[PDB]
């Protein structure tokens, strides 16, 4: 009984989190009401990792949603799945963040973030023996920005020992809401690198891209984008959800050999436009698996090296015809995997495949290559703040200049210390 | 796609064999570190062997026969005709040799006095010739109080073996010569004659009244091109081809070389090969051999083969690296990873 | 080729064959290890939460 | 009669465990519910099989043994599985969080909290040992507990019974079935704390058990409970002349005695023949000579290396099944001509030799075919120190750039026990070359 405690904060936060457990609870035969409706004694299995179960055998999820706008959550609760939240789960204010990370670190997100806690607590306190969380919020809004590393820092004194896990939202000019991104990203990135042990890197540019390139969408929406992020957050938790020959700290031994170089690319495989129904073998879901195009941190890996490469395959396939796949990619590029880390590609089974496929391949790889990403929002941070553009959100909320300069200054450091590893 | 890792930027044949690789556009080269390879062209001196055939779906080939040495060293050469069943100790292709270790340090001193005073009392030739691995470090004479007082001036073992005092003269010139064969031994242990050989000539006529001077007693191409003063004067580089060396038989001999040369080579080198295979053969190992050997052989003036050494890292003539090289990669490389005549060796048969 | 020892009984026998013939940390010391490591932890943990605290 | 006491640590300690006390009862004629008609001593008895069982006055034959993990999700499968009626509650003892295949964490982090009651639970069991000759560790190499934990209870057991001998069967890690990156790093960290510990050490590499299982049962991608199975057996072949009439290996201290002349050197490498699919059509039975000849051959050897090049200290035949030793000494006498067997000059040339009437018994519906004679050669080469070499390469590369230290260091280890752990590899590695090469 290793629990998992889930926290989404901010629109972001809570619309890809809302996404997430409704893809996963028809996985394991959730129904919208909490009642189980599977075939398979393997949805069950590893259920109580992601749910509580309740009177008259009723599974709730543990997770808890978090704003500082009524907006969004009630847009979840009269969801398809919005009735199978604990309706106590329920934390949100009414002041709204304003695209501002000072609001949700600061003010506004300081007034709420022990009622949230409390929900926390709860959650923990009934767990048999909990392995740690996971967040899914935004980095470049107000609330899962600022509030939600405010969440991790305050989670993080209160179960030092347990571990942090988030899936983030990382802001492009080409998907926009606000100019004031790159600096809500760079001080919530800061964070991360303290406070987390593993960050899921996801681009809103990859998701744009290859929504437009790839699957062909003409003019993509965020429901588009997330339906990627489902079905990414899906598979990279199969290790968790289901039964094979893996908990976050053992994940996190074998994918982390820095402390501070704990962020991911995610991908996911196959995905086609609507040629749907052609059955996708075991060279292609791993050419794509592996290809640019297919990640979602929007960074070339062929131009960085891969640290620790995590790859899971779902469904019914040739186990023998998977391992001859994986170890011809790396034998057909290791230039791009350091030598210094031996077996550092690692392949998993799941029998079970994702809702319509006969079968998925997704990849979890701890890539150099992620500083191009750290590296357009300095850019794009330093554009700005060279002119102290737009600084008077922040310092009408009582941070100082200096704040920022050191934000700019660890994110630089991140990047120089890919760098060195690169090489 | 295949990859290979070079870990011996000294080799003159394998530098060629690489080069012939990538012009293929099949086989990649990698850090000569990396353990994802399927060919090592690996280092001379501690191989690491132990670690190859460990890597998951990846078949591995190297270059060198583990235990090899045997075959390839001075002493060890000695010790292995000496000791093995195969060869024996009357072997009749292999000079009476000796092996000594300084007195500075099992050894055969007093076997080889015994010997020795066997053929100064009976009025025979007694001239020795004592050598090393660690020379560059040669010394002839026909008094063993000068062979074994040279060998303990040094600090490494020294190996005492009869030197043949009536060698095949070439004419014009009254000199000396040896003959270097190329053999390859692939995965399957099938042993591959090179049809091309080379004879290194001494440019100075051969003198049997003076070993001081050893330039034209020793036939080494550094030796000749550094202290002969004849050096290129009858072949170019002191390099008779076998055609040319073919054509002499002929014409003074009234011989071949398939005949009076070709068939003790031959026989020779299956001998030495077959006779440490059960020690180096790959055949049921997590990993594959292959080897490039050079064996140095001395012919007498009876027309009589006999075996100098067996060199493990040898260099070939100029004139033979495209054909050699090209070959190694058919045979050796491509064999075991094939790619998307008349062959140039002479298979040698034999029972596994 | 020499045989010694040979040893008989109903679940079977055992001999030698011969071819050729020849020519700690204390209790106390390891509960010190231990509670030094413990001592360690313990140490990075107060300066998590020291930093934390600032 | 002396008592033995196993003990198995971490997963693979527990599954090896869980499939050697299988084979064990099946051989022995004891049922899953702990009866065994034969034994027509009831609750009691001296006999050789009751080395390795205690019996209760109900007829009941309890295995001598304690099953230690530090999450329960294996032990579970004991609790519950055929054999769930052999133990009783106290044999097996579960955490409820593992060591993230951190030896840190398992040696220290855990093992401290821990420590005292698997001691408690093992002093229950010599408690009932008139005799106690010693213990057999099951354990892997990679596993957090397997590395971490096994460490501390060895250096707390030379405490607790200074004078018993302490066997171990340790899994060399093999990348074909490990997710763990990080398993070089246990791997020696556990060898240099368990080294002075640890009387005679049977290492399998599941790189070796791997190949065998495809190659000879055809069985494309091996499964945990196909390494167990074939594992068992081996395991079993060592074990037998504990468990049954004998006079050679007929207590832990005769296996240093027999392969350990030197301490450090005390990793015999094991060879075991011959191995048939039970799926074939119907094999030919092999000979003496031929069973004999394939103790040579690397194919089978639970360790990839290569004797040829190496030396030899000692030399064990285990025989099983319809042997007589007038066919192994023609058999012997056969390979010496033909193979390549070098032994050291400070020990003779000779191989002791143990012949068990009966033959192999195979897991019914299992993948191993029965055999009308069967041979474990335990042999004790310097080649093995290949096996040293590989890992503590492996360790040279990630420690270089400090890959992945934090997260022992993290849990209370000092970073110059990695150095340390790694120079006594350095010297174990020279001890080989010492006695095996000129
Ligand atoms: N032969 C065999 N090897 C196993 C088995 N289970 C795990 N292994 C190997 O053991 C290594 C992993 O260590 P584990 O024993 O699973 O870890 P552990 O001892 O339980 O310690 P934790 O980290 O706390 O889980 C890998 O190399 C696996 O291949 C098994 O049942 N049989
Ligand atoms: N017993 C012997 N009788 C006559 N000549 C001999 C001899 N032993 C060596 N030589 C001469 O020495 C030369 C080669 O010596 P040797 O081969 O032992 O040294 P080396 O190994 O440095 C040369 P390489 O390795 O290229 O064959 C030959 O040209 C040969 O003429
Ligand atoms: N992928 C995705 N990104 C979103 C979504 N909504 C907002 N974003 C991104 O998140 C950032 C704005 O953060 P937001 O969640 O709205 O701020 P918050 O509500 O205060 O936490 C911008 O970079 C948006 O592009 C969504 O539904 N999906
Ligand atoms: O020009 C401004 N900031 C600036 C300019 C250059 C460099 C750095 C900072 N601020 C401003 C301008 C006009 C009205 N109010 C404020
Ligand atoms: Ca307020
Ligand atoms: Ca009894
Ligand atoms: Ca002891
Ligand atoms: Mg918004
Ligand atoms: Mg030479
Ligand atoms: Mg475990």
């Known amino acids: 009984m290793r629990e998992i405690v889930h926290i989404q904060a901010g629109q972001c936060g809570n619309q890809i989190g809302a996404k997430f457990w409704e893809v996963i609870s028809d996985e394991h035969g959730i129904d919208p009401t909490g009642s189980y409706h599977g075939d398979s004694d393997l949805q069950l299995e590893r259920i109580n990792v992601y749910y509580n179960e309740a009177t008259g055998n009723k599974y709730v999820p543990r997770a808890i949603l978090v704003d500082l706008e009524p907006g969004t959550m009630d847009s979840v609760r009269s969801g398809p799945f919005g009735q199978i939240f604990r309706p106590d789960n329920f934390v949100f204010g009414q002041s709204g963040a304003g695209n501002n990370w000072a609001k949700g670190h600061y003010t506004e997100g300081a007034e709420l973030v022990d009622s949230v806690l409390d929900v926390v607590r709860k959650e923990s306190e009934s767990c048999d023996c909990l392995q740690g969380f996971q967040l899914t919020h935004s980095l470049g809004g107000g609330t899962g920005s600022g509030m939600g590393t405010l969440l991790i820092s305050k989670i993080r004194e209160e179960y030092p020992d347990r571990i942090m896990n988030t899936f983030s939202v990382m802001p492009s000019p080409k998907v926009s809401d606000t100019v004031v991104e790159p600096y809500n990203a760079t001080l919530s990135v800061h964070q991360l690198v303290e406070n987390t042990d593993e960050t899921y890197c996801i681009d809103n540019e990859a998701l744009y891209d290859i929504c437009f390139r790839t699957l062909k969408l003409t003019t993509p929406t965020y429901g588009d984008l997330n339906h990627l992020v489902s079905a990414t957050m899906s598979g990279v938790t199969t290790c968790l959800r289901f039964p094979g020959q893996a908990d976050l700290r053992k994940l996190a031994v074998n994918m982390v050999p820095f402390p501070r170089l704990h962020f991911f690319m995610p991908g996911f495989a196959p995905l086609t436009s609507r040629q749907q129904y052609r059955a996708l073998t075991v060279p292609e879901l791993t050419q794509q698996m592996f290809d640019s195009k297919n990640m979602m941190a929007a960074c070339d890996p062929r131009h960085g090296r891969y640290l620790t490469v995590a790859a899971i395959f779902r469904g019914r396939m040739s186990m023998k015809e998977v391992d001859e796949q994986m170890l011809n990619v790396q034998n057909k590029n290791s230039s791009y995997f350091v030598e210094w880390i031996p077996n550092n590609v690692k392949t998993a089974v799941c029998d079970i495949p994702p809702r319509g496929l006969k079968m998925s391949a997704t990849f979890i790889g701890n890539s150099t290559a992620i500083q191009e990403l750290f590296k357009r929002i300095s850019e794009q941070f330093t554009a700005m703040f060279r002119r102290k553009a737009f600084l008077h959100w922040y310092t009408g909320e009582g941070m100082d200049e200096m704040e920022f300069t050191e934000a700019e200054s660890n994110m630089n450091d991140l990047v120089s210390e890919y760098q060195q590893y690169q090489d | 796609m295949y990859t290979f890792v070079v870990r011996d930027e000294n080799s003159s044949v394998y530098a060629e064999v690489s080069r012939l690789l990538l012009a293929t556009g099949q086989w990649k080269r990698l850090r000569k570190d990396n353990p994802r390879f399927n060919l090592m062209l690996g280092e001379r001196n501690r191989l690491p062997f132990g670690r190859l055939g460990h890597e998951p779906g990846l078949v591995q080939l190297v270059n060198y026969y583990r235990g090899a040495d045997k075959l390839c060293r001075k002493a060890s050469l000695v010790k292995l005709i000496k000791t093995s069943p195969e060869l024996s100790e009357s072997c009749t292709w292999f000079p009476e040799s000796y092996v000594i270790y300084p007195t500075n340090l099992t050894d055969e001193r007093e076997v080889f006095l015994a010997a020795y005073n066997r053929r100064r009392e009976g009025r025979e030739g007694n001239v020795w010739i004592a050598k090393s691995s660690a020379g560059a470090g040669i010394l002839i004479s026909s008094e063993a109080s000068e062979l074994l007082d040279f060998i303990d001036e040094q600090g490494q073992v020294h190996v005492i073996q009869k030197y043949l005092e009536k060698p095949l003269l070439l004419e014009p010139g009254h000199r000396k010569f040896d003959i270097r064969s190329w053999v390859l031994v692939d995965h399957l242990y099938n042993i591959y004659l090179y049809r091309e050989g080379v004879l290194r000539t001494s440019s100075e006529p051969y003198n049997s009244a003076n070993f001081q001077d050893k330039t034209c007693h020793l036939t080494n191409h550094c030796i000749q091109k550094e202290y002969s003063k004849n050096y290129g004067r009858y072949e170019e580089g002191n390099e008779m081809f076998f055609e040319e060396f073919n054509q002499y038989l002929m014409d003074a001999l009234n011989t071949t070389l398939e005949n009076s040369i070709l068939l003790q080579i031959k026989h020779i080198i299956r001998s030495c090969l077959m006779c440490i295979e059960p020690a180096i053969s790959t055949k049921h190992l997590h990993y594959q051999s292959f080897q490039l050997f050079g064996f140095d052989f001395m012919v007498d003036e009876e027309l009589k083969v006999w075996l100098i050494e067996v060199n493990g890292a040898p260099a070939c003539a100029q004139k033979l690296y495209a054909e050699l090289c090209q070959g190694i990669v058919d045979v050796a490389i491509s064999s075991v990873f094939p790619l998307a005549p008349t062959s140039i060796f002479i298979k040698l048969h034999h029972h596994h | 080729m020499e045989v010694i020892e040979l040893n008989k009984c109903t679940s079977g026998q055992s001999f030698e064959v011969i071819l050729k013939p020849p020519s700690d940390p204390s209790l106390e010391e390891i509960q010190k290890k231990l509670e030094a490591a413990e001592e360690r932890r313990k140490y990075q943990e107060a300066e998590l939460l020291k930093h934390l605290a600032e | ?438």
Request: charge should be negative; hydrophobic fraction near 35%.
């Open chain 4, 1 to 438: 009669m002396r008592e033995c006491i196993s003990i198995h640590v971490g997963q693979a300690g527990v599954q090896i465990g869980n499939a050697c006390w299988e084979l064990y009862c099946l051989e022995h004629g004891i049922q899953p519910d702990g009866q065994m008609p034969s034994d027509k001593t009831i609750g009691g008895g001296d006999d050789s099989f009751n080395t390795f069982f205690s019996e209760t006055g109900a007829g009941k034959h309890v295995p001598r043994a304690v099953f230690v993990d530090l999450e329960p999700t294996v032990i579970d499968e004991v609790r519950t599985g055929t054999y769930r009626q052999l133990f009783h509650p106290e044999q097996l003892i579960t955490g409820k969080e593992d060591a993230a295949n951190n030896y840190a964490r398992g040696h220290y982090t855990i093992g401290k909290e821990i420590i005292d009651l698997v001691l408690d639970r093992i002093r229950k069991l010599a408690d009932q040992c008139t005799g106690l000759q010693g213990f057999l560790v099951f354990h892997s190499f990679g596993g957090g507990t397997g590395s971490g934990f096994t460490s501390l209870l060895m250096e707390r057991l030379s405490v607790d019974y200074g004078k018993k001998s302490k066997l171990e069967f340790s899994i060399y890690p093999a990348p074909q079935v490990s997710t763990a990156v990080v398993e070089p790093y246990n791997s020696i960290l556990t060898t240099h704390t368990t080294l002075e510990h640890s009387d005679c050490a049977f290492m399998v590499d599941n790189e070796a058990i791997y190949d065998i299982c495809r190659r000879n049962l055809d069985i494309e991608r091996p499964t945990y409970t196909n390494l167990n199975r074939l594992i068992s057996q081996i395991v079993s072949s060592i074990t037998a002349s504990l468990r049954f009439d004998g006079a050679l290996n007929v207590d832990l201290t005769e296996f240093q005695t027999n392969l350990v002349p030197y301490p450090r050197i005390h990793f015999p490498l094991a060879t075991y023949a011959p191995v048939i699919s039970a799926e074939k059509a119907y094999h030919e039975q092999l000979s003496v000579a031929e069973i004999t000849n394939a103790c040579f051959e690397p194919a089978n050897q639970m360790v990839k290396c290569d004797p040829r090049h190496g030396k030899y200290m000692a030399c064990c035949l285990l025989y099983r099944g319809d042997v007589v030793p007038k066919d192994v000494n023609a058999a012997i006498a056969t390979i010496k001509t033909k193979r390549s067997i070098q032994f050291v000059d400070w020990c003779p040339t000779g191989f002791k030799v143990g012949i068990n009437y009966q033959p192999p018994t195979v897991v019914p519906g299992g993948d191993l075919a029965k055999v009308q004679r069967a041979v474990c050669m335990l042999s004790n080469t310097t080649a093995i120190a290949e096996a040293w070499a590989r890992l503590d390469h492996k360790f040279d590369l990630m420690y270089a750039k400090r890959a992945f230290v934090h997260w022992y260091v993290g849990e209370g280890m000092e970073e110059g026990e990695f150095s340390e752990a790694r120079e006594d590899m350095a010297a174990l590695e020279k001890d080989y070359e010492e006695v095996g090469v000129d």
